Design a protein around this ligand. Structure first.
Ligand SMILES: CSC[C@H]1O[C@@H](n2cnc3c(N)ncnc32)[C@H](O)[C@@H]1O
Ligand SMILES: Nc1ncnc2c1ncn2[C@@H]1O[C@H](CO)[C@@H](O)[C@H]1O
Ligand SMILES: NC(=[NH2+])NCCC[C@H](N)C(=O)O
Ligand SMILES: O=S([O-])[O-]
Ligand SMILES: O=S([O-])[O-]
Ligand SMILES: [Cl-]
Ligand SMILES: [Cl-]
Ligand SMILES: [Cl-]
Ligand SMILES: [Zn+2]
Ligand SMILES: [Zn+2]
Ligand SMILES: [Zn+2]
Ligand SMILES: [Zn+2]
Ligand SMILES: [Zn+2]
Ligand SMILES: [Zn+2]
Ligand SMILES: [Zn+2]
Length: 269
């Protein structure tokens, strides 16, 4: 049925899906219903959506939320949304979601275009939001929920899990989109922690530059003789918390220990 509505609109408006901007439209209603339901959308919520496409998720959000902001890069798609729908409570913003200024919202409920997965997510993690329910390329989702010590645990994994509980709610087959992409998707829930861990970006980048290294080794390669001599640096590294771990095995809390330790010895400010 939603599939039927897609084919109706494609020929009604002469839409040519563009792969330059990864145009793959969700056509499985169960996936939209699961997103909405996970998001627990209520009449007080202000929702951010990226890449509304033909508006199938947008429409479900508009009927339940106080307001939806939706960011769309394709001007033609915007014109179609304006003609096809009549919402009283949706503001369409034109631009690349990675570049434009975001409005204030408390929840994101969105398909995420494959090509902006990383910059969208890092931008999101620097925002105040109560809940995020976002569809990612499966491989990127797996990266986001990867555990410390796993092969794909990376800076993204750490920063996202530092901010929130991150989990995969469902896998979404490629057959769920028209045109059919070459990758699967996953629905990801991000539940911001009461106990938010806020980590120094510079420490994290330095550590994760070579994340297979032991913590002492990565610190040895990052610490300069800036208000601290060679022997002082050797003393500092000798007593670093979590000296027995490699970087890729660190929880957010353990990075925080290293950060607080470096702060007390003068190395960060
Ligand atoms: C549903 S496929 C992605 C949808 O988001 C749009 N889109 C793709 N890339 C971006 C982006 N960087 N910012 C906003 N919308 C985007 C596409 O035009 C399509 O409607
Ligand atoms: N002695 C230092 N004082 C201040 N910042 C430093 C010092 N040594 C390294 N840093 C910065 O902190 C990062 C994490 O250790 C390093 O890559 C570097 O940018
Ligand atoms: N590695 C050196 N610079 N050695 C010279 C003596 C350093 C001195 N024993 C110290 O620990 O402060
Ligand atoms: O694909 S957009 O140009 O409607
Ligand atoms: O290796 S750390 O947890 O002590
Ligand atoms: Cl694509
Ligand atoms: Cl409706
Ligand atoms: Cl050095
Ligand atoms: Zn059909
Ligand atoms: Zn594609
Ligand atoms: Zn249900
Ligand atoms: Zn409607
Ligand atoms: Zn890949
Ligand atoms: Zn390396
Ligand atoms: Zn140096």
């Amino acid at each position: 049925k939603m599939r039927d509505r897609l084919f109706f609109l494609l020929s009604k408006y002469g839409i040519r899906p563009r792969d330059s901007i990864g145009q793959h439209f969700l056509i499985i209603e169960d996936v939209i219903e699961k997103a909405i339901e996970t998001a627990n959308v209520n009449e007080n919520d202000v929702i951010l959506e990226v890449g509304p496409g033909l508006g199938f998720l947008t429409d479900e959000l508009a009927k339940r939320a106080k307001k939806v902001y939706t960011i769309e890069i394709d001007q033609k798609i915007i014109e179609i949304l304006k003609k096809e729908y009549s919402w009283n409570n949706v503001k369409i913003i034109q631009g690349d979601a990675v570049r434009v200024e975001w409005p204030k919202f408390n929840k994101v409920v969105s398909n995420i275009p494959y090509k902006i997965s990383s910059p969208f997510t890092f931008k999101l993690l620097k925002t105040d939001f109560e809940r995020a329910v976002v569809m990612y390329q499966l491989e990127f989702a797996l990266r986001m929920v990867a555990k410390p010590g796993s092969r794909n645990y990376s800076r993204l994994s750490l920063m996202a899990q530092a901010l929130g509980n991150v989990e995969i709610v469902m896998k979404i087959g490629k057959g769920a989109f028209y045109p059919r992409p070459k990758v699967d998707s996953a629905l990801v829930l991000i539940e911001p922690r009461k106990d938010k861990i806020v980590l120094n970006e510079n420490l994290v980048k330095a550590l994760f530059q070579h994340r297979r290294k032991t913590v002492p080794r990565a610190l040895k390669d990052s610490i300069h003789m800036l208000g601290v001599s060679k022997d002082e640096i050797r003393g500092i590294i000798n007593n670093v918390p979590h000296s027995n771990k490699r970087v890729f095995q660190l929880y957010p809390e353990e990075v925080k220990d290293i950060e607080e330790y470096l702060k007390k010895h003068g190395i960060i400010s």
